């Protein structure tokens, strides 16, 4: 009868550029259902450097064209958002590296750290890439970034 604000934190090093589109994603996903009232999404750098570095030109025109809404500001997490978010995934990337031993000295955590994964389909499809250049390449990460929370959003619907 009454539903419930699951909370989610995507998480990945270097929030710009392949990386922040699965979380404006996140928000298009949640925004187009009734279900943005129910859902406390947000990004996670995990770094220092990018913290405040707001989307490059070449992925802040293309999330924010078709429609994707990004008003939040990468930061780097910290323990506030671990315990508070539940579902803290991240990119791959660093196959739970440090978000796995993150948890470990955050004061009181709670957000159950993962990786995306096979969702909706049913293959091995993991991004154990560290970049993919950015000429030639952009929009296709993008695009892997719409089921990056929405296939995620399933299972946590």
Known sequence: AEQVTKSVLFVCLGNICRSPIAEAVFRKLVTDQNISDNWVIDSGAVSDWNVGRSPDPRAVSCLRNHGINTAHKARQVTKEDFVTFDYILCMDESNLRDLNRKSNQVKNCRAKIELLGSYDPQKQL????????????????????????????????
Not at 129 to 139: Q, R
């Open 126 to 157: 993991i991004i154990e890439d560290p970049y993919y250049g950015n000429d030639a390449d952009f929009e296709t990460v993008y695009q892997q970034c719409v089921r990056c929370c929405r296939a995620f959003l399933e299972k946590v619907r």
